[PDB]
């Protein structure tokens, strides 16, 4: 059973993890040499490089799953790596599903697991965990406003101008364009007002709404992170009870 | 009598409220989803279900008054809602005027109080409702500066550019475009600087005013919230 001991030692090794991280970085840096248009002599180079990296990472994932069978299916990272290697093999056998092997360039994300011990990273990740509920409320509320306004926009402007409003599945896209303040007058409403001369009753209040919500979002953060820190000296007023 | 107590027991069933909410999600969902190549055979059935759901909805809104006689009227909620009930039932036997039937979606605002039911959503809705009036004062204040700048704009750029400064009912719109920082340079100002070479003196201080409305707005919110 000493080979299981060998796998437990040599697989669980800092040199092994460091080697596999430098190999993933070399995957990325070889993958990012592509330029178009191509002489096609590079193309048979690039396919072979994809093949070699895919096979080496398959040998990697097999050796990583050999050491335990049920301790797997536990972290999302290993399942995610299994999905990546699986999609790459599906591209490797079957014909042109090109552009579905392009998910593979996310494994550089694994570099984050190297830098847990950095003291500077801890402040920004504690910042990023301290924002989440406000954003996750704002997303649902703004989604409800979109679902209210989009159906009304489809019924109003639907017969004429179909390219921008002819279904729900594009009315969403046009209202997401108009929210972030790009070309909403010169490329949207100025052709609308030539045909429907009362279109400015619809788009002008809408802008107010989303703009209002966004400013509140920012200042909500600016009071909330301000609100807890004062509490961190309020207990010292308890320390000032004796004084 | 006792049947009054019975109808109070029936109308407080929240399963009926969830049913009518999902039902009217579906009711709004119908005529939206239609492909504009219109087959007009199931569109007839869409009009039928339109009639049916408005009828069931009217049965609800008149069945409401048997429980609450006056206390239903006191609520500011279910008032604009009742008004849009009436404006929805206008459509059934009247002439073809649109722009009134299409308001039938708005009562998805009913689930706003479902938003009130969530304890996590308690914070931000109260944060909005407590802060509306200090924003309303600022809205009136900058409406006055739009009205003072539009009249000044029309008399300088009315001749020779009638298409987007020719009258007040369009000068207001063009200057609202210029406030929100969209395409003011390549679309508005530089085609004017080939005729009146001192035009920027009127437009660059304008952005120094209505864009630095945004700074005291934050002060009003931060003092309030």
């Amino acid at each position, epitope marked *: 059973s000493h080979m299981y001991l060998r796998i437990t030692n040599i697989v669980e090794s800092s040199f092994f993890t460091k080697f596999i991280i430098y190999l993933i970085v070399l995957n990325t840096l070889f993958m990012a040499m592509e330029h178009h248009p191509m002489t096609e002599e590079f193309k048979n180079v690039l396919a072979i490089g994809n093949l070699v990296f895919t096979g080496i990472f398959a040998i990697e994932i097999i050796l990583r799953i050999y050491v335990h069978r049920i301790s797997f299916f536990k972290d999302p990272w290993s399942l995610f790596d299994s999905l990546i290697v699986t999609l790459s093999l599906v591209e490797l056998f079957l014909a042109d599903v090109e552009g579905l092997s392009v998910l593979r360039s996310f494994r550089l994300l694994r570099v984050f697991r190297l830098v847990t011990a950095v003291p500077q990273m801890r402040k920004i990740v504690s910042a990023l965990i301290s924002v989440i509920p406000g954003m996750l409320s704002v997303i649902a509320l703004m989604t409800l406003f979109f679902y209210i306004f989009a159906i009304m926009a489809t019924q109003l402007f639907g*017969e*004429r*101008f179909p*390219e921008w409003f002819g279904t729900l599945g594009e009315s969403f896209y046009t209202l997401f364009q108009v929210m972030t303040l790009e070309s909403w007058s010169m490329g949207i409403v100025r*052709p609308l007002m*030539e045909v429907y001369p009362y279109a400015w009753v619809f788009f002008i209040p809408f802008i107010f709404v989303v703009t209002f919500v966004m400013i509140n979002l920012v200042v909500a953060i600016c009071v909330d992170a301000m609100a807890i820190l004062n509490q961190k000296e309020e207990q010292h007023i308890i320390d000032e009870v004796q004084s | 009598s006792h049947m009054y107590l019975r109808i109070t027991n029936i109308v407080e069933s929240s399963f009926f409220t969830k049913f009518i909410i999902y039902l009217i999600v579906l009711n709004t969902l119908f005529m939206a989803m239609e492909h504009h*190549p*219109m087959t007009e055979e199931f569109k007839n059935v869409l009009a039928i279900g339109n009639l049916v759901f408005t009828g069931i909805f009217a049965i609800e809104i008149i069945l409401r008054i048997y429980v609450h006689r006056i206390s239903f009227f006191k609520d500011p909620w279910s008032l604009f809602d009742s008004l849009i009930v009436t404006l929805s039932l206008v459509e059934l036997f009247l002439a073809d005027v649109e722009g009134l039937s299409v308001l039938r979606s708005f009562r998805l605002l009913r689930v706003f109080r479902l938003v009130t039911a969530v304890p996590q959503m308690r914070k931000i809705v109260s944060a909005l409702i407590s802060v509306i009036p200090g924003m309303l004062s600022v809205i009136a204040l900058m409406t006055l500066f739009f009205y003072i700048f539009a009249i000044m704009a029309t008399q300088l750029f009315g001749e020779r550019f009638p298409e987007w400064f020719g009258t007040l009912g369009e000068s207001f719109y063009t200057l609202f475009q210029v406030m929100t920082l969209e395409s003011w340079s390549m679309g508005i100002v530089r085609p004017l600087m080939e005729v009146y070479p001192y035009a920027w003196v009127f437009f660059i201080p304008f952005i120094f005013v209505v864009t630095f409305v945004m700074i005291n707005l934050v002060v009003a919110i931060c003092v309030d919230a």
Partner: antibody
Amino acid sequence: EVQLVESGGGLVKPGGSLKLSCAASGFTFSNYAMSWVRQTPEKRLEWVATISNGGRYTYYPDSVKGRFTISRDNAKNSLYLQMSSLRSEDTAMYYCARHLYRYDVGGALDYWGQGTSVTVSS
Amino acid sequence: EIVLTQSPALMAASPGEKVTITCSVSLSISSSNLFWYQQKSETSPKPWIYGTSKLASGVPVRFSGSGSGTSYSLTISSMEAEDAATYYCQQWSSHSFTFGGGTKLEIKR
């Protein structure tokens, strides 16, 4: 210059096909809709087809449904009308036409072509 | 569907005359979408009146049209030397165009 050229044309036996091509010249072609309108030799018009700016939305009348096909290509500024399985009552003069307001279907028709004749006889 | 009705079939006139031609339809239709067209001999027809109140570009200022509801009309103030043509009234609908039947002028002599 703003012009329209309308190629093809001629005589086809009843049951054949023909593919017509309109090429526009001068305006920004990727910002209008376009439409085909025919005329009988008895001096009467009859709408045939239209298409939006992009190429994803088409429209047809009842009487030719599922038989005529319209297509665009912006990168060569060209308009294709592909036909099949003609009838006797289609011996007509065809016209390529531009709509009036930008980005719009279903308005006026401000600028036409010059007609191409298609005849069905055995 | 939305179908038209023209009147008269034919009409002939002497120059220097204020004549009137009509167009009608089987349903009430708004006045912002209704157009006119003019056709000479061997000419692809040209846009002539937009929106039943306005002339097109290059049109002489002697023509006008008016009406509403299900009744629309054109008025010629003084008939000229080149105004023997055939006229059309156009209407837009649910998703399908619709043309009239043509009305033709002649010079009496």
